[PDB]
Protein backbone atom coordinates (compact mmCIF):
# COMPACT_ATOMS: atom_id res chain seq x y z
CA UNK A 1 0.00 0.00 0.00
CA UNK A 2 1.38 3.41 1.13
CA UNK A 3 3.83 1.21 3.03
CA UNK A 4 4.75 -1.28 0.31
CA UNK A 5 8.32 -0.87 -0.76
CA UNK A 6 12.03 -1.32 0.10
CA UNK A 7 13.09 1.22 2.70
CA UNK A 8 16.62 2.07 3.96
CA UNK A 9 17.30 3.46 7.40
CA UNK A 10 18.57 7.03 7.21
CA UNK A 11 18.29 8.29 10.83
CA UNK A 12 17.78 6.94 14.34
CA UNK A 13 17.32 8.69 17.67
CA UNK A 14 17.44 7.01 21.10
CA UNK A 15 17.67 3.42 19.77
CA UNK A 16 20.38 2.47 22.28
CA UNK A 17 18.23 3.76 25.14
CA UNK A 18 15.21 1.87 23.77
CA UNK A 19 17.17 -1.37 23.56
CA UNK A 20 18.50 -0.90 27.03
CA UNK A 21 14.97 -0.38 28.36
CA UNK A 22 14.03 -3.70 26.75
CA UNK A 23 16.92 -5.31 28.75
CA UNK A 24 19.20 -5.86 25.75
CA UNK A 25 22.79 -6.53 26.66
CA UNK A 26 25.90 -4.84 25.34
CA UNK A 27 26.82 -7.21 22.49
CA UNK A 28 23.33 -7.27 21.04
CA UNK A 29 22.95 -3.45 21.43
CA UNK A 30 26.27 -2.98 19.70
CA UNK A 31 25.02 -4.97 16.75
CA UNK A 32 21.72 -3.10 16.58
CA UNK A 33 23.10 0.39 17.19
CA UNK A 34 25.00 1.23 14.08
CA UNK A 35 23.06 -1.22 11.85
CA UNK A 36 21.43 0.53 8.82
CA UNK A 37 18.83 -2.06 7.86
CA UNK A 38 16.57 -2.26 4.89
CA UNK A 39 12.90 -2.89 5.65
CA UNK A 40 10.91 -4.56 2.84
CA UNK A 41 7.14 -4.40 3.26
CA UNK A 42 4.83 -6.36 1.00
CA UNK A 43 1.19 -7.46 0.99
CA UNK A 44 -0.55 -10.52 -0.52
CA UNK A 45 -4.22 -10.98 0.16
CA UNK A 46 -4.82 -10.74 3.88
CA UNK A 47 -1.15 -11.20 4.78
CA UNK A 48 1.41 -8.43 5.30
CA UNK A 49 5.12 -9.33 5.37
CA UNK A 50 7.84 -7.12 6.90
CA UNK A 51 11.42 -8.22 6.26
CA UNK A 52 14.27 -6.46 7.95
CA UNK A 53 17.70 -7.10 6.49
CA UNK A 54 21.12 -6.08 7.80
CA UNK A 55 24.61 -7.35 7.61
CA UNK A 56 24.61 -9.07 11.02
CA UNK A 57 20.93 -9.77 11.48
CA UNK A 58 17.79 -10.43 9.45
CA UNK A 59 14.22 -10.89 10.67
CA UNK A 60 10.82 -11.42 9.07
CA UNK A 61 7.25 -11.34 10.25
CA UNK A 62 4.06 -12.13 8.36
CA UNK A 63 0.70 -11.33 9.89
CA UNK A 64 -2.94 -10.57 9.39
CA UNK A 65 -4.17 -7.26 10.84
CA UNK A 66 -5.82 -7.78 14.24
CA UNK A 67 -4.65 -11.40 14.60
CA UNK A 68 -2.08 -12.06 17.39
CA UNK A 69 0.98 -14.01 16.37
CA UNK A 70 4.08 -15.39 18.06
CA UNK A 71 7.32 -13.56 17.20
CA UNK A 72 10.99 -13.99 18.03
CA UNK A 73 12.46 -10.53 18.04
CA UNK A 74 15.94 -9.51 16.80
CA UNK A 75 17.11 -9.59 20.48
CA UNK A 76 15.59 -13.07 21.02
CA UNK A 77 12.54 -12.12 23.04
CA UNK A 78 9.57 -14.50 22.66
CA UNK A 79 6.67 -12.15 22.32
CA UNK A 80 3.00 -12.11 21.40
CA UNK A 81 2.46 -9.45 18.70
CA UNK A 82 -0.65 -7.79 17.32
CA UNK A 83 -0.63 -5.28 14.49
CA UNK A 84 -3.54 -3.04 13.47
CA UNK A 85 -3.96 -0.17 11.03
CA UNK A 86 -5.39 2.97 12.84
CA UNK A 87 -5.70 6.26 10.92
CA UNK A 88 -3.03 5.24 8.44
CA UNK A 89 -0.57 4.14 11.13
CA UNK A 90 0.52 0.51 11.48
CA UNK A 91 0.49 -0.03 15.22
CA UNK A 92 2.38 -3.03 16.61
CA UNK A 93 2.36 -4.11 20.18
CA UNK A 94 4.61 -6.83 21.59
CA UNK A 95 3.68 -8.42 24.91
CA UNK A 96 5.97 -10.60 27.05
CA UNK A 97 6.50 -11.22 30.80
CA UNK A 98 3.88 -8.67 31.75
CA UNK A 99 5.64 -5.94 29.65
CA UNK A 100 4.73 -4.32 26.39
CA UNK A 101 6.37 -2.21 23.75
CA UNK A 102 4.82 -0.41 20.82
CA UNK A 103 6.19 0.12 17.34
CA UNK A 104 4.21 2.59 15.25
CA UNK A 105 4.96 2.93 11.51
CA UNK A 106 3.66 5.85 9.50
CA UNK A 107 4.19 7.48 6.20
CA UNK A 108 5.16 11.22 6.31
CA UNK A 109 6.24 13.02 3.10
CA UNK A 110 9.06 10.82 1.70
CA UNK A 111 9.69 9.11 5.03
CA UNK A 112 8.63 5.88 6.73
CA UNK A 113 8.74 7.03 10.34
CA UNK A 114 8.98 4.40 13.08
CA UNK A 115 8.27 5.30 16.69
CA UNK A 116 9.37 2.71 19.30
CA UNK A 117 8.28 3.16 22.90
CA UNK A 118 9.27 1.21 25.98
CA UNK A 119 8.22 2.77 29.29
CA UNK A 120 9.55 6.38 29.29
CA UNK A 121 11.86 5.92 26.29
CA UNK A 122 10.80 6.98 22.81
CA UNK A 123 12.95 6.14 19.80
CA UNK A 124 12.38 7.54 16.31
CA UNK A 125 13.74 5.85 13.23
CA UNK A 126 13.39 7.22 9.70
CA UNK A 127 13.60 5.27 6.50
CA UNK A 128 13.51 6.47 2.91
CA UNK A 129 12.85 4.49 -0.21
CA UNK A 130 15.87 2.54 -1.54
C1 LIG B 1 11.63 -4.04 12.25
O2 LIG B 1 11.70 -2.64 12.17
C3 LIG B 1 12.59 -1.77 12.85
C4 LIG B 1 12.23 -0.40 12.58
O5 LIG B 1 11.04 -0.18 12.21
O6 LIG B 1 13.17 0.43 12.77
C7 LIG B 1 12.64 -2.07 14.34
C8 LIG B 1 11.63 -1.78 15.25
C9 LIG B 1 11.74 -2.12 16.60
C10 LIG B 1 12.83 -2.80 17.11
C11 LIG B 1 13.84 -3.09 16.19
O12 LIG B 1 14.99 -3.76 16.55
C13 LIG B 1 15.12 -4.22 17.84
C14 LIG B 1 16.52 -4.70 17.99
C15 LIG B 1 17.40 -4.85 16.92
C16 LIG B 1 18.70 -5.29 17.12
C17 LIG B 1 19.12 -5.58 18.41
C18 LIG B 1 18.28 -5.43 19.51
C19 LIG B 1 16.96 -4.99 19.30
CL20 LIG B 1 15.86 -4.75 20.65
C21 LIG B 1 13.75 -2.72 14.83
O22 LIG B 1 14.80 -3.01 13.97
C23 LIG B 1 15.06 -4.28 13.62
C24 LIG B 1 16.54 -4.38 13.35
C25 LIG B 1 17.42 -3.34 13.68
C26 LIG B 1 18.76 -3.40 13.49
C27 LIG B 1 19.30 -4.58 12.90
C28 LIG B 1 18.47 -5.63 12.52
C29 LIG B 1 17.09 -5.55 12.78
CL30 LIG B 1 16.02 -6.89 12.42
93: CATH = 2.40.128.20
Using what technique was this structure determined? X-ray
Distance 59 CA to ligand 1 centre (A): 9
Structural domain range at position 78: 7-129
Give Cα 120 to chain centroid, integer Å. 18
The reply to whether 1 falls in a domain is: no
Resolution as reported, in Å: 1.1
Q: Give me ligand 1 centre to Cα 87, in Å.
A: 23
Ligand 1 close to Cβ of residue 106 (< 6 A): no
Q: Identify whether 15 is part of a domain.
A: yes
Pocket test for ligand 1, best of 30, 51, 74 (most atoms within 8 A of CB): 74
Q: Is residue 86 part of a domain?
A: yes
* Domain contains 2: no
Instruction: Confirm whether 72 is domain-assigned.
Output: yes
Contacts of 32 by beta carbon, 8 Å cutoff, 6+ apart? 15, 19, 24, 57, 74, 75
Number of domains in the chain: 1
The answer to whether the CB of 94 is under 6 A from ligand 1 is: no
- Strand 69-72 to 38-44 pairing: unpaired
- Determine if residue 18 is labeled as part of a ligand binding site: no
For residue 84, give the H/E element and its range. Answer: strand 78-86
Is 123 close to ligand 1, i.e. is its CB under 6 Å away?
Answer: no
**Phi then psi dihedrals of residue 27, to 5 deg:** -60, -50
Count other C-beta atoms under 10 Å from residue 34's C-beta.
9
Residues contacting 30, CB < 8 A, separation 6+: none
Atom number of ligand 1 nearest to Cα 112: 5
Amino acid sequence: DAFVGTWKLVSSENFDDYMKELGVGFATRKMGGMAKPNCIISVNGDVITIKTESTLKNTEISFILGQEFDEVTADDRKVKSTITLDGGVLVQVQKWDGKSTTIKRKREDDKLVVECVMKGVTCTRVYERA
